[PDB]
Design a protein around this nucleic acid. Structure first.
Ligand SMILES: [Zn+2]
Ligand SMILES: [Zn+2]
Ligand SMILES: [Zn+2]
Ligand SMILES: [Zn+2]
Lengths: 60, 60
DNA sequence: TTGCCGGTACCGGCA
DNA sequence: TTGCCGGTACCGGCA
């Protein structure tokens, strides 16, 4: 299947340490139950929720 | 000089609406005093600071 | 102080 | 329930 890192970048993975994880020299894990993180949107949520906090601090 | 958007992506900008801002159809502002945001690192800070908050909630 | 190249990081979709 | 292309978004540096 696909290595954790490749799954994240959705890049072709040559395992079953994968090639890409080479150029990066990182822990090439094989977690068949891993699902990439949608960084962008994610951090968007965070920053949004983080904001609410301040508008809460300015009210307590 | 460079349009706000191009500065952000540090891409060649053809203004002085720029080309890129076309393919994107966005507000091609010319803010000579604008400086890109280092998204990555930035959101990193946010998420880190955001974290401290929870370890503070679990203590108040 | 500021423009952009060359090179990853991310992702919308389409299988 | 996934692998990955094709196309941006981001940036480390080098001017
Ligand atoms: Zn891989
Ligand atoms: Zn790998
Ligand atoms: Zn531009
Ligand atoms: Zn522009």
């Amino acid at each position: 299947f696909a290595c954790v890192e490749c799954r994240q970048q959705k890049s072709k993975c040559d395992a079953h340490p994968c090639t890409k994880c080479a150029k990066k020299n990182v822990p090439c894990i094989l977690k068949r139950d891993f699902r990439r993180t949608y960084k962008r949107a994610r951090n968007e949520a965070i920053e949004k929720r983080f904001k609410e906090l301040t508008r809460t601090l300015t009210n307590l």
